[PDB]
Amino acid sequence: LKISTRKTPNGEGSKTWDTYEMRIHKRYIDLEAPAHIVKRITQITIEPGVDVEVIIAA
Amino acid sequence: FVPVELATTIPVEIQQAQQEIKLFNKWSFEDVEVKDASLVDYIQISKPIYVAHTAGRYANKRFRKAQCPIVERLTNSLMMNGRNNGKKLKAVRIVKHTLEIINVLTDQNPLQVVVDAIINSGPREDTTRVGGGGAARRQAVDVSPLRRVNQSIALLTIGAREAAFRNIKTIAETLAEELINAAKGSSTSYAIKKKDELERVAKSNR
Amino acid sequence: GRVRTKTVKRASKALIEKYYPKLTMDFQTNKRLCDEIATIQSKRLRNKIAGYTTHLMKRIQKGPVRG
Amino acid sequence: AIISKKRKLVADGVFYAELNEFFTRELAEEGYSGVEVRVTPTKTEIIIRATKVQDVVG
Amino acid sequence: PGVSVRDVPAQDFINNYASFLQRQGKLEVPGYVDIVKTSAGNELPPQDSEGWFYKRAASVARHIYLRKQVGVGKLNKLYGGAKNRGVRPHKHVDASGSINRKVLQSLEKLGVVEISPKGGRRISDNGLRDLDRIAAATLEDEE
Amino acid sequence: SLVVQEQGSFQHILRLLNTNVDGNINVVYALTTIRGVGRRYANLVCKKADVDLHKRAGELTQEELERIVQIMQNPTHYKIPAWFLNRQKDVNDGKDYHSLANNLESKLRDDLERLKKIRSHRGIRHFWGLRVRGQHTKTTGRRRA
Amino acid sequence: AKHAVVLDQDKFDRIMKEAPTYRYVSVSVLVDRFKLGGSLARVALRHLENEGIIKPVSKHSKQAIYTRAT
Amino acid sequence: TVPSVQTFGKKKSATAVAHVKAGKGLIKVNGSPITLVQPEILRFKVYEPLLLVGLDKFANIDIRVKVTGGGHVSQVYAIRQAIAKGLVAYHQKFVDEQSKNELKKAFTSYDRTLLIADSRRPEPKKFGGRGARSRFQKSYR
Amino acid sequence: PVTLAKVIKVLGRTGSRGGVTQVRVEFLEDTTRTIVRNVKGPVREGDILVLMESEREARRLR
RNA sequence: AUCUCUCUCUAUGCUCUCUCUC
RNA sequence: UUAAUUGCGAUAACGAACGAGACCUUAACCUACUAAAUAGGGUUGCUGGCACUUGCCGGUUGACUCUUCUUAGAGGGACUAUCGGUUUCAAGCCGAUGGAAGUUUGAGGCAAUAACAGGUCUGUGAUGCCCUUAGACGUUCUGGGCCGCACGCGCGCUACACUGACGGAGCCAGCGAGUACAACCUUGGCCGAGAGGUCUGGGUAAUCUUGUGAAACUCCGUCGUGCUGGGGAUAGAGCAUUGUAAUUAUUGCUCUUCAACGAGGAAUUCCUAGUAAGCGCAAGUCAUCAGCUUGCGUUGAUUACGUCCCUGCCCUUUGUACACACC
Ligand SMILES: [Mg+2]
Ligand SMILES: [Mg+2]
Ligand SMILES: [Mg+2]
Ligand SMILES: [Mg+2]
Ligand SMILES: [Mg+2]
Ligand SMILES: [Mg+2]
Ligand SMILES: [Mg+2]
Ligand SMILES: [Mg+2]
């Protein structure tokens, strides 16, 4: 995620650019697994920063 | 000569002794006659390149520029002035056409003719703005071989360019003609004339 | 351009001082030794150190060396 | 949110920044340091750092 | 031993196909043949009056044979090019949108190009056969 | 492609629609010299006439020329709709016209006069001698009259 | 060029008798040696190449490379 | 099924992928023969490895190249590289070490990539200039 | 008149602008002469250098 | 005892000023 | 010596600390490992076509098998390695071999001390102080205006044509970006000759748009030394689109109108390899508009590898009637 911005807050000066970037990591997993127990498993253990998303379909 | 049996269609020429002898897109890379003593590894020849279009590193060392095929260098030089920066394919095509023209007119292997032209255009004595206070004083300086060759090539290309600037004559034909003139016969080509003038200037100065 | 840092040189010197048993001429073995013995934060630096150690060793096996 | 993952992450970042700003503004005497945002699917946890804890509590 | 469309040279093949089309009676021409510039990104209409639309049709057929799921829009994108805005640097503008559609319709009428239930147009078996025949003819012409 | 050498039949430099039509320009591009006539539309006219474009300016027989003229002056009857001709819709008749040679300029003049009469911005600009269609005269138009 | 875009009979005859002896035949060449200047020269060249007369070397358009039979 | 070797070819960003099998004598670019590629002039560039090695070394081969990226010239180069690489891979797998050496020797009388993948990759375009190294245009006064 | 001499050693590079090389030229026709010559452009050891000038020589370039 | 040997015009310019606590 | 207060070394200095370097970020190399209908293959089914005796080219979410390409993750890789000579043989350097690569491997990103009376209160709820504070310099609505034009500079674009232009027809890219508590990127099928409409669905993301079938280029033509089909400014007239609102053409598209402009004075910028230039594209702005920037990627040269002559800079010495410091 690149945001190209002039570093100068006024514009008076030389043409200086900074591309403030945020590299975002996805990484997915596919589980062919049972029900309630699986659901229980796919909820626990949380590290600060990473977001876990579990979808649906039976 | 010796047809190789494949499921895919291959032309007859390819099948023939072009597999055996690897010289050009159907031209002699042999003969090998440089009129001046040695001059090799400054005018390349030898390595029998098929088509004058190789992507390599020829600026990343001092003299490595020499190991460019002369035809390729010519093509590169042709690739000049706004409308034609990049588009090396065009240059290659033009070179091919030039070669064909040479073959047609006064026969011979065109490569040799090209070599001759390169030899006989380029200058022995050159001028540098040495200064003497920044003023109009130019000491006569003799030229190094590779540089001289390059200069000759450039002037040849320049001649062609000059010819083509609003004319019926397509670049290639004109180039061929001027090359022929440079080699030997008339010496009424632009590039050669320029070179001679430069030499004269150098002579009248020190 | 390849004239190396002071720190790297110092490290090499230290290694020579303290680990002349071990370290030879084989750059890959030397590298491994450096990785083991010296605790360095980056690979490039380690490599450089190893190289300089090798150089020092070469110098040694041609007569006694200053410093 | 239902919005794109990347966008969601950006929004979260912005929210974090906002929170930090708020804390800087409000918790002057309370002796504020730093914030963390931990997100569990049901509960959103914010861990605030300070020196005068009683004041922060109330 | 045999022939297919990919293995025979582009332009020659196309011209042969055009010739074949001309020879054939069925084509269903528009009421605006060589009245349109074939592209809004183009300055001047095609030359040599008769045909050219035939050629375009042939080209379209070839493209369809090559791929699988090609619609009108994609075809339009394929054709055209840089529009001389004059003083302003030339942006890529697509071809005339209706002409391609018309061509496709014509092909359908002839029975060479059909539709797939995913979106776009695909080749018909008869069309494939025709293409193969044309390829064979081209080969014969060569040697 | 034509192998025909042609004898003394074609007469170069023709006086067609008052304005002089020059020699050996390619029919369409020979017609372009006339005002109101322009490239693509000339080509279209030629096509309508059913004369081959790959011919000389002097080559054209009189009948063909006449036909071309007819096509030009009366355009609507020969399948030429709106996205085609000069004064589409028009302000004076409601019918569209493909104005030519010494007509378009006259029309323009008339329009200018009307603008002047009714003191509109464009008209005012024209009267002055200034640039109309969205231009900054900070740099634009230093050639003058 | 002062016009000279005519496939004149005399001109054609001249072309027929001047294209031999000279090894190279092109539009540019024709223009140079004063006969036809421009577009119809190409046409003439094409219609000289039906069977024999001048043999082709070029497998390329825009620039023509042609040699008379020896 | 007969064992077959997969290879690739790189230039700029253009990616060729060759599949060398045992068969009759196939040499294919996407779905077409090498007798086409595209630019007609550069047909010899892709044909060159074959010319070097010997066309008989193909009497038992099947070659198919899937090419994506670059432009045209780059694509051609990549294809050529893949073909060379394919041949060498085949030799490594099925033939003999001396043969491989010979092949290498034949190639390295040129070394237009062929067996070794090219370096020289696009440099990023910096701010304050239209090009990577090219600065803008200094106005002064 | 035509003469040619092989280069063997470079005596540095001199010039107000620079670039122009001072070379030691040895004649392949009689190796008894090693002269100080002005050469414009890229030049190494063991190169045949054609000379339109026969005898005139200069060192420093100013 | 080893140097070697370089070169010329170019005039002027008016808008301040600053310390601590031991 | 080195790009370097980078080293080696001589040593009233010794031991340091920033800075540089290292370091990160990517770009290259990994037929090595982990892996993959959101990435491609491989064989075979299921079929389609032509050869027909095996076959070639495909289509299809059929299985199953992997992972070289595409993605990443851990890692590895080069350290100047190996010689060859040169140099108080130390520091290093140039050439050759091997290597994906030997310019610090290319480019970045962070950038010291000290400042400038540089820039901005027109980024701010970052504010001191002075002012105006109710017919208000606050505030919003309506309409202009910043876009005016005798002129003078600064960027940039298009051209001055055959390597062209104009037609066809070949055909190939990488960064992106894109839907919710709103009106996005838009495919596919019919309208229109363009622009753009229109019913539908896909896609709030490696899946759909999009393989962004992008140009420039490539081949067959047509034109052919002509201010001419080069150039498309300026003008008309008309059809849509965005918007409550297009006149002072918003833009777009069709038309006609065809000027200056024959490669550019003195001057001066930019550049030493995937670089220069040509060529596009996407993004930023954005309701609508790119000639703009910012990032990609195609096409790919020529000439250096050096000197201090001009223009600066660095230290050392030197001379200063100069510290507002040669302005
Ligand atoms: Mg050594
Ligand atoms: Mg760095
Ligand atoms: Mg204020
Ligand atoms: Mg008031
Ligand atoms: Mg403004
Ligand atoms: Mg600027
Ligand atoms: Mg035009
Ligand atoms: Mg143009």
Ligand SMILES: [Mg+2]
């Ligand atoms: Mg892609």
Ligand SMILES: [Mg+2]
């Ligand atoms: Mg004109």
Ligand SMILES: [Mg+2]
């Ligand atoms: Mg606006």
Ligand SMILES: [Mg+2]
């Ligand atoms: Mg003074």
